[PDB]
Structure 1
Amino acid sequence: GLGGLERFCSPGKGRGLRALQPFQVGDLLFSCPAYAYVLTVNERGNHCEYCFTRKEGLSKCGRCKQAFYCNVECQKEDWPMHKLECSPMVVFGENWNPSETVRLTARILAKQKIHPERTPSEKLLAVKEFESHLDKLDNEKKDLIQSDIAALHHFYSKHLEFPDNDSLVVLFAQVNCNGFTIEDEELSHLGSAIFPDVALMNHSCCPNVIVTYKGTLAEVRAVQEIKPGEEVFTSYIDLLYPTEDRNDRLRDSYFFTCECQECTTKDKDKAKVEIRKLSDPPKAEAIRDMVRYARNVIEEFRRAKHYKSPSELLEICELSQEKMSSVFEDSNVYMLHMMYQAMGVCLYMQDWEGALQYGQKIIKPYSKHYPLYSLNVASMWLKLGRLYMGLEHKAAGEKALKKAIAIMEVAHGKDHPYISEIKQEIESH
């Protein structure tokens, strides 16, 4: 068990984490070494496969030529996990396409054969003790696990001895309910992992902690004062959206409805869906209908980026904003989503000016919509600072980077490798 905290039975929330000592804003509650983890395929070559160090000139794996390390020591240390994919990647060639979840579950099973004893990642909660919601799964979900089990057998049959299909369906349900995505300082996808003690914490739309990553290590820091006896709540979802949206995400992904202060009260809901103060105000049915269009275009875009062109996507972004603007104010979260999506396309296209334009429009409303310390906000300021600096706007860049640093010092810590690199960006300009 972790010092200063304890595992407990949270009424109507199963098992949780409770404080035994007071924690102040920016205080490290605990750190959890990754139990199992995997670097995302598009990040290969950018980051070391073993320690997740983003560094220039990484050593390639002579065999597969698709795994990169700091040195030979990272390579030897990652071999027990890398051997699950080394030869399969070359023997399957381009037929090699397991999903990140399948990839992660192959490594959970591998860690289980190698180290069946409780790991330093499980001082409070064990992988085997994970909640699965097996009895709550629909047909869509059960079919996804069945295609994942199929792919697990198809690609990882060489080194693993598999349990029955009932044990594999339970495991996949646990990974999908307790799995973590690792993001960088710009909230960009790096990989997926298993942090058992971090998964003991329950959800709140007003969390008292923020999870950050330092390589493959998860760090938990207070973003609100925590007093002895208080439960330690972290957010599972994006805190920008109104109550209904948040709870629709929670029920689909984690099979529960949140009763937190934000969800009970619904106080921040009206601010979130800001309506245009028109001389002829919009009707309640007109509002209900625009929120339906907004929730719909959001889904259409999630698909359209897999099959439409960069400029076809910016057109959706502009066209939907233009439609919504009649009823909705610029600060409305639905407008803000389409703006965020468009800034993402400009950043992809390497159109730094266009990205900076949408950035400038997003930032202020986005600031007030999220909690005081937010990874989303810190990343928006960071993007904005990096663009300003890029386009040689040194005064504005310095201001946005100093804002990103202020939040990041609380959530990541003053001593973080990300903050030292941002500080280095301000001193190089």
Structure 2
Amino acid sequence: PLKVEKFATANRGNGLRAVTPLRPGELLFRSDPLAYTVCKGSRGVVCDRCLLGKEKLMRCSQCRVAKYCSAKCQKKAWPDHKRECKCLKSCKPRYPPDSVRLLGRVVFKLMDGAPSESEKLYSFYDLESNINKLTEDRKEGLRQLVMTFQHFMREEIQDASQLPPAFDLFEAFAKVICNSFTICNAEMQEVGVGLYPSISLLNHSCDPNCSIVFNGPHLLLRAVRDIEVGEELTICYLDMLMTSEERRKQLRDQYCFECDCFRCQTQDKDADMLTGDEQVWKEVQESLKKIEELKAHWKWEQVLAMCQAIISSNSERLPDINIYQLKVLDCAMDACINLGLLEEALFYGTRTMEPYRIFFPGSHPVRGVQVMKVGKLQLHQGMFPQAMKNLRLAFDIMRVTHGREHSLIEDLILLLEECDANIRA
């Protein structure tokens, strides 16, 4: 019996609404992807199948592009990799855009696969394309994606007889632009991209009542507020560390809508997010383009060097509530964790705690994981009472955002039992 249902909204197309009263932490839906792939920067760093990092991955001998953590993952991936393998090989050393590899997997799944549980509420065929709102600039970009797909797939797809009935590649890429989910690993790093068509019913809010979290490619949808029967379910499509101007640009450019929510009407939190000298934070925002690019490619030493040049600048510094400063602190913390600089990681991580409390209100999985990382860093350095406080807070958040069905909650229940025994001792 589903707790959610598809409905026609007044002015935001189709949506999902509650069938039954929902409480914070309630599991509403869970889905494997219709199709997914690893992202450009994580290719050959994480397993193509399970999206877990491993120092040495095994490569597909045929294409040498797909890489796996294990014989189990390589073998289990083969049916969904078989047809793209011929195309990735044939187009060596060209690697396609992530959207093109993703749509390849969509087409092979729809042609060769049994009906997907991912499409239970809503199918790829049903997805919003926003074709009547696309700008001429966007349409030109979509025409290039169509020709890129035609080139990439030529070994496996020669004509429309090898696409689903009346499948339109332009319309398919338009659907991918506004229905793609970025898959994060347990540590909330972007590692993949997938389509989850049932989950695609959820409309956006800058202050949502639901949250999604990934456990490998598996998506969990949870309530993070009380929700009444018939109330629309919403998620935030966007990173929380964004001003209303930045959200406006992304919701226009990617999603073709104007956000009417209270936060956008009032520029909620924009002033605090932009505190400090504007010349300095403009420079840090500019530097973050490179820092985030390096992070996406797991280049931790280069990330840390660029972040230290800002955090410990000889020139003017920013407050930690400035969102560009905060993103630099978080990138520096993760670089330090990966480089085993755990003292320096904890310095940066603790500085993010109050800004995260402000910018991730209520129960947000990004805050839950940040607090768990700081708790773990404290536990490693023998700060047992402070570690226990942070691991308990992480559990309070993550019982709502992750739940018992997420493997990270099992790992946190272990850190809590350990920290508790130390305190008992």
Q: TM-score range by the shorter chain?
A: 0.7 to 0.9
User: 1:244 matched to which residue of 2?
Assistant: 245
CA contact (8 A) 1:346 1:352 kept: yes
* CA 1:241–1:76: 2 relative to 1, 3 Å: closer
- Post-superposition offset of 1:397: 3.4
1:294 partner amino acid: W
Match of 2:307 among 314, 338, 341: 314
Aligned to 2:107: 109
Counterpart of 2:182 in 1: which secondary structure?
A: strand
Check if 1:124 corresponds to 2:121: yes
**Equivalent pairs: percent with the same residue?**
31
Aligned residue type for 2:125: K
Q: Structure 1 residues 360 and 151, CA, compared in 2 at 3 Å: closer, same or farther?
A: same
CA distance change for structure 1 residues 122 and 404 in 2, over 3 Å: closer, same or farther?
A: same
Residues in 1 aligned to 2:43 and 2:245: alpha-carbon distance in whole angstroms: 38
Distance 1:75 1:185 in 2: 21
Greater CA drift, 24-33 or 54-63: 54-63
1:171 aligns with 2:172: yes
CA apart distance, 1:60: 6.1
Alpha-carbon distance between aligned partners in 1 of 2:359 and 2:128, rounded to the nearest angstrom: 31
Does the alignment pair 1:340 with 2:330? yes
Q: Deviations over 1:150-194 (max 9, x none)?
A: 332333222234549992221111111101011122111231111
Aligned partner letter, 1:131? E
Read off the aligned partner of 1:298 and give its amino acid letter.
Answer: Q
**Distance change (3 Å), C-alpha of 1:24 and 1:86:** same
Q: Could you say which residue in structure 2 is the equivalent of 1:294?
A: 281
Does the aligned pair in 2 maintain the 1:321–1:338 contact within 8 Å?
A: no
Contact 2:36–2:102 (Cα < 8 Å) also in 1: yes
Match of 2:133 in 1: 136
Which residue of the partner structure matches residue 149 of structure 1? Answer: 146
Distance 1:333 1:261 in 2: 20
Does structure 2 conserve the Cα–Cα contact (< 8 Å) formed by 1:297 and 1:320? no
- TM-superposed CA distance for 1:258, in Å, is 1.2
Give the aligned partner of residue 29 of structure 2.
30
Shift of 1:56: 9.9
Measure the CA separation in 2 of the matches of 1:220 and 1:79.
28
Structure 1 residue ranges without an equivalent (≥5): 276-289
| Cα separation, 2, equivalents of 1:155 and 1:228 | 47
Instruction: Provide the secondary structure at the position in 1 that maps to 2:155.
Output: coil
Q: How many residues are paired up?
A: 408
Range moving further from structure 2, 410-419 or 41-50: 41-50
Within 2, Cα distance between the matches of 1:338 and 1:382? 19
Distance 1:197 1:313 in 2: 40
What amino acid sits opposite 1:67 in the alignment? K
Check whether the contact 1:320–1:338 (CA below 8 A) recurs between aligned residues. no
Normalised by the size of structure 1, how large is the TM-score?
0.82
Matched with 1:407 is 397
- When structure 1 is superposed on structure 2, of 226-235 and 394-403 the one drifting more is 394-403
Aligned residue runs from structure 1 range 50-65, under 5 A: 50=49, 52=51, 61=60, 63-64=62-63
How far apart, CA to CA, are the structure 1 residues paired with 2:412 and 2:181? 25
Deviation (angstroms), 1:372: 0.9
Give the match's secondary structure for 1:84: helix
- Residue in 1 that maps onto 2:80: 81
**Helix, strand or coil for the counterpart of 1:207?**
coil
SS at match of 2:414: helix
Q: Is the 8 A contact 2:204 2:234 kept in 1?
A: yes
Does the CA contact (< 8 Å) of 1:212 and 1:411 recur in 2?
yes
Paired with 2:38 and 2:144, the residues of 1 have a C-alpha distance of 22
